[PDB]
Amino acid sequence: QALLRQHPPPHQEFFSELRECAKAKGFFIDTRSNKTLADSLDNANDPHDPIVNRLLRSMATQAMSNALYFS
RNA sequence: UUUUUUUUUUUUUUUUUUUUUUUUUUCUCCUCUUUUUUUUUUUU
């Protein structure tokens, strides 16, 4: 008896086009764990432009799952 | 030196009654365009 808040893991398909565009300018990423997701993200820092990080994490933020309550 | 007479303002009053807002039409009718539908997160 309580009420908790979950984020069940995502699946590859919202990542597919993401990976595509990562596979368009340089960056190699992989999808096996939120640890290595976040790591292989935060390193990629395109030198001659600022928008890249914002934009990439924002399409990443169009990918993922939901947060809903349960007893 | 000029007398006498020719009516006037309809009579009547001591009758019972058990309803009720309104009121009566007008037909079927092509909604145009990046999408699956996004979604955690924190500061109110």
Curated annotation (Swiss-Prot):
Transmembrane segments: none annotated. It is found in: Cytoplasm. Signal peptide: none annotated. Belongs to the RNR ribonuclease family. Component of the RNA exosome complex. The catalytically inactive RNA exosome core (Exo-9) complex is believed to associate with catalytic subunits EXOSC10, and DIS3 or DIS3L in cytoplasmic- and nuclear-specific RNA exosome complex forms. Catalytic component of the RNA exosome complex which has 3'->5' exoribonuclease activity and participates in a multitude of cellular RNA processing and degradation events. In the cytoplasm, the RNA exosome complex is involved in general mRNA turnover and specifically degrades inherently unstable mRNAs containing AU-rich elements (AREs) within their 3' untranslated regions, and in RNA surveillance pathways, preventing translation of aberrant mRNAs. It seems to be involved in degradation of histone mRNA. This is DIS3-like exonuclease 1. The chain holds residues 703 to 773 of 1054 of the full protein.
